[PDB]
Amino acid sequence: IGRFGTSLKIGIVGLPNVGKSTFFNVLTNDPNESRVPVPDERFDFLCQYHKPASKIPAFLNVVDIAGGNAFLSHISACDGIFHLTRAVDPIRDIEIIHEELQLKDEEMIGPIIDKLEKVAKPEYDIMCKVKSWVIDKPVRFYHDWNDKEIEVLNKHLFLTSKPMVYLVNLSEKDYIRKKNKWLIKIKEWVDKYDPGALVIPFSGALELKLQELSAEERQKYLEANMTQSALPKIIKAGFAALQLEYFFTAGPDEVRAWTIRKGTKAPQAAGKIHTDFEKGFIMAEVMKYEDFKEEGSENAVKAAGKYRQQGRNYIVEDGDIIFFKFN
Numbered sequence: 001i002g003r004f005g006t007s008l009k010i011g012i013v014g015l016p017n018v019g020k021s022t023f024f025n026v027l028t029n030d031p032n033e034s035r036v037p038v039p040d041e042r043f044d045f046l047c048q049y050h051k052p053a054s055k056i057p058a059f060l061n062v063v064d065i066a067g068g069n070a071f072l073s074h075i076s077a078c079d080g081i082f083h084l085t086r087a088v089d090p091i092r093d094i095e096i097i098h099e100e101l102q103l104k105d106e107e108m109i110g111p112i113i114d115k116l117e118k119v120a121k122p123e124y125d126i127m128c129k130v131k132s133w134v135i136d137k138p139v140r141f142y143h144d145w146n147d148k149e150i151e152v153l154n155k156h157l158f159l160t161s162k163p164m165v166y167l168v169n170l171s172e173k174d175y176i177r178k179k180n181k182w183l184i185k186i187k188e189w190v191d192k193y194d195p196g197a198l199v200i201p202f203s204g205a206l207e208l209k210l211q212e213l214s215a216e217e218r219q220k221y222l223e224a225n226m227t228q229s230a231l232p233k234i235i236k237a238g239f240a241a242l243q244l245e246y247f248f249t250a251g252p253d254e255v256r257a258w259t260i261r262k263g264t265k266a267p268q269a270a271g272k273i274h275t276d277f278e279k280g281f282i283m284a285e286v287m288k289y290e291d292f293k294e295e296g297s298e299n300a301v302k303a304a305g306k307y308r309q310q311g312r313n314y315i316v317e318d319g320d321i322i323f324f325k326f327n
């Protein structure tokens with residue numbers, strides 16, 4: 001479903017006084033959006049290996065909804081939801097936020113019947129299907145769709161068609177000691193009512209102390225308490241939820257993550273670098289990260305028969321290290 005292309009955004013969503021600003025602040029460290037580097041082990045490896053002038057990873061765009069009803073205006077203006085949540089208290093809360101979003105959808109589906117009711121034509125067929133489904137359920141819970149259906153769906157970008165990742169905000173203590181009444185029940189719920197949904201705990205407090213403390217004391221802190229920042233796992237969760245991923249260009253001058261959508265084929269992949277490449281492109285030279293690491297160098301990868309040469313019909317895969325060729 002969703003918008004076309006790679007210019008997506010994920011939105012920070014939940015009730016007030018639940019850590020939104022903190023959560024936003026920590027990511028940062030436009031005042032309502034920020035781009036955050038995605039952390040990646042591969043990237044680091046490639047970068048250490050080539051020691052390039054220029055290092056450029058992928059980024060997540062995250063929106064700290066400032067502006068409900070106007071609130072939902074901005075949600076429709078995002079491509080998925082970071083459902084933030086505090087730790088009855090968080091389950092009532094989850095049911096609420098789901099309630100609003102489902103109700104904003106029916107409320108918009110109304111006129112979409114009205115205006116369509118004069119059959120001048122095949123679209124009318126499918127909107128019923130949707131309404132029928134959204135007078136039960138969220139759009140996304142229907143894992144069966146088609147080209148005709150997605151077209152129409154994408155016309156209105158319903159709130160319940162956006163994907164969702166649950167973030168449970170916690171006291172320093174519960175994250176660290178790794179047990180919390182609510183996370184159990186939330187996970188119970190998510191399994192019952194949103195199967196597959198990611199639930200990721202974290203502590204805004206904790207994360208913010210870590211911003212303040214010196215990389216030295218910082219490390220002493222994370223050593224002492226046998227714990228980790230939760231952020232990297234959340235940034236990746238967001239990116240993954242947007243259906244984004246990337247490929248690499250590594251060489252002595254630059255290593256770079258190039259964000260793409262699942263299914264992007266090599267010519268559109270190359271067009272990210274320069275738009276003449278979508279047409280101008282005869283093949284892509286691909287090395288999987290695994291092989292480059294194992295074999296230990298490009299000539300080793302080549303010598304071992306693993307430096308594959310894909311044509312114009314190749315779906316780039318996440319992690320591919322690619323030299324694109326033209327003319």
Ligand SMILES: Nc1ncnc2c1ncn2[C@@H]1O[C@H](COP(=O)(O)OP(=O)(O)CP(=O)(O)O)[C@@H](O)[C@H]1O
Nearest residue numbers: 016017018019020021022023169170171172204205
């Ligand atoms: N796990 C936790 N530990 C300590 N303090 C916490 C906490 N979760 C939230 N808080 C506190 O709540 C206060 C307000 O948090 P924050 O501004 O991030 O929430 P919010 O953005 O939902 C308020 P608003 O609704 O005005 O945007 C902060 O000063 C923060 O210390």
